[PDB]
């Protein structure tokens, strides 16, 4: 869900449910929307061991 290169599902009510169930807590979950021109920006955790 970071990088788009493919068409989504046709039912958009299905597409957001498939997307917000993955994204909702990942270490690599993207930002608020993805930008049209730009990058996913991959929000940083406060620390790493």
């Amino acid at each position: 869900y970071l990088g788009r290169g493919a068409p989504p599902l046709l039912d958009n009510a299905a597409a957001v449910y498939l997307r917000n169930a993955v994204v909702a807590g990942n270490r690599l979950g993207p930002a608020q929307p993805l930008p049209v021109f730009g990058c996913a920006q991959v929000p940083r955790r406060a620390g790493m061991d």
Partner: protein, 148 residues
């Protein structure tokens, strides 16, 4: 060998049929001497409820006559029938073949609940439920082979 052990994995913890009642039902699938009045009653009742309690005396005699000859259950090709025998014909059968119809139905309801354990809750998507998107049996996209 993968797929069988994959069903060994899900098989514990939930209902398994008795090994006695398997040989009762399996012996009717291989029954070469199978009397065809049961096939003529099966086209007769044709998945109706009013016809079944009309012919309720005939069916409980035909099964009990068949149970005395072979230890098998004869109506087991039609699930619309087998549900009616459990629902309507509870009393007047010998109870061992009554449990043959009871266990086979109760193994279906254990398979219907297996989808509900594995399908997570969620919204309707495309007018269909979550388990209709997950598993094929709750999905109405496929339909049963004999629809009365």
């Amino acid at each position: 060998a993968f797929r069988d052990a994959r069903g060994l994995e899900l098989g514990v913890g939930r209902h398994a049929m008795a090994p006695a009642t398997i040989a009762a039902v399996r012996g009717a699938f291989e029954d070469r001497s199978y009397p065809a009045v049961f096939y003529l009653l099966q086209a007769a009742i044709h998945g109706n409820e009013h016809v079944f309690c009309a012919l309720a005396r005939l069916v409980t005699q035909c099964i009990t006559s068949y149970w005395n000859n072979t230890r098998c259950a004869a109506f087991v090709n039609d699930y619309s029938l087998v549900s009616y025998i459990v629902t309507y014909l509870g009393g007047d059968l010998p109870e061992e073949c009554m449990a043959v119809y009871r266990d086979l139905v109760a193994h279906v309801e254990a398979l219907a609940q297996l989808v509900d354990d594995f399908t997570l809750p969620g919204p309707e998507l495309g007018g269909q439920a979550q388990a209709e998107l997950n598993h094929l049996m709750r999905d109405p996209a496929l339909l049963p082979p004999l629809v009365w």
